Design a protein around this ligand. Sequence first.
Ligand SMILES: O=C1C(=O)N(Cc2ccc3c(c2C(=O)O)OCCO3)c2ccc(Br)cc21
Ligand SMILES: O=C1C(=O)N(Cc2ccc3c(c2C(=O)O)OCCO3)c2ccc(Br)cc21
Ligand SMILES: O=C1C(=O)N(Cc2ccc3c(c2C(=O)O)OCCO3)c2ccc(Br)cc21
Ligand SMILES: O=C1C(=O)N(Cc2ccc3c(c2C(=O)O)OCCO3)c2ccc(Br)cc21
Lengths: 149, 149
Amino acid sequence: SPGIWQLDCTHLEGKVILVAVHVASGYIEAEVIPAETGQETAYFLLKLAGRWPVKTVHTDNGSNFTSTTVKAACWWAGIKQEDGIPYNPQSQGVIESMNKELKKIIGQVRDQAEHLKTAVQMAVFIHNHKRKGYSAGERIVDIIATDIQ
Amino acid sequence: SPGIWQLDCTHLEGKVILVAVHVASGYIEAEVIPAETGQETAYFLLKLAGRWPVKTVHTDNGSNFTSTTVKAACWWAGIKQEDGIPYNPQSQGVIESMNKELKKIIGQVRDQAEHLKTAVQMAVFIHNHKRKGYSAGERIVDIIATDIQ
Ligand SMILES: O=C1C(=O)N(Cc2ccc3c(c2C(=O)O)OCCO3)c2ccc(Br)cc21
Ligand SMILES: O=C1C(=O)N(Cc2ccc3c(c2C(=O)O)OCCO3)c2ccc(Br)cc21
Ligand SMILES: O=C1C(=O)N(Cc2ccc3c(c2C(=O)O)OCCO3)c2ccc(Br)cc21
Ligand SMILES: O=C1C(=O)N(Cc2ccc3c(c2C(=O)O)OCCO3)c2ccc(Br)cc21
């Protein structure tokens, strides 16, 4: 569980926000892309796995699960690519709720920046620092550190 | 010192590689940009501070130290902006040594990817996972987790 992440793709302002969620902590990383392609997904996963110990990725849809570039990047980075099928049905809803919450945050900061990509990174910042009392950033670090010991 | 980072800018293939090093661990994040402007630097710092608890950054030169956009981002993200003058002279050399090693890694993977930005991210991955036996990615997580408790 410390190495498990879920991909999520959501849409805003005619663009795509790609999100990776660290399932046990709720910590996220995100980027704005013009469209979700295998190549963009593969590059996002290489960035993520260079930053955190990514063991398994639950992919967000079958096109990315199938994509040969995604599979090349998972092989390169040592990642086990799995489906993201919500076998525990509370999954569809957790992700939907996360997308809702992110977009709400983006709307709270949207006026402070011109580019959507800046507002998305502000929202990443606010989500990961929010006290829930630990934050997601604190949880992911404690989870992986406990794992290291 | 768990919250201290150093920015570093280096050049390759007529492009700029912007690097943030977590001083205590050697862990890095990096990006390729066409040129090192305040706006790119500010955006890079926002991304970094949304992913790790960045308390202080030693900026890589006086133009970023001065940049009003950089200072706006440091204010937004709660980051103390400092100079990066090597008062400990071994700093000039440690950074030079890092740039040399990164470029070496890049040259080792350069042929596996078409875009420079992909090879840079492969090199981030190899650097942060290399055991020297803890890796930089392991050190940074242990350092911050110790700090959390
Ligand atoms: O509200 C949520 C949520 O459900 N999460 C996902 C999530 C998944 C698993 C978890 C989570 C979260 C989370 O609440 O962030 O928290 C405790 C650990 O288990 C979010 C992630 C980003 C953003 Br913006 C909002 C949210
Ligand atoms: O709000 C902004 C912002 O406007 N940018 C920088 C910026 C400066 C000038 C611009 C910008 C942006 C931007 O939104 O990226 O959009 C193009 C027009 O001119 C930020 C970078 C980091 C952080 Br925190 C906040 C911001
Ligand atoms: O060779 C180095 C180095 O000196 N570091 C920077 C650094 C700074 C401070 C440290 C470092 C390192 C490090 O070796 O990464 O190691 C232990 C903690 O103290 C590098 C970072 C990335 C890459 Br690619 C190469 C290197
Ligand atoms: O080696 C590549 C690669 O070529 N890319 C993907 C890629 C696919 C097709 C392309 C690419 C790239 C790329 O280098 O980004 O360049 C444009 C030409 O067509 C990678 C993404 C993640 C990871 Br790991 C490795 C790679």
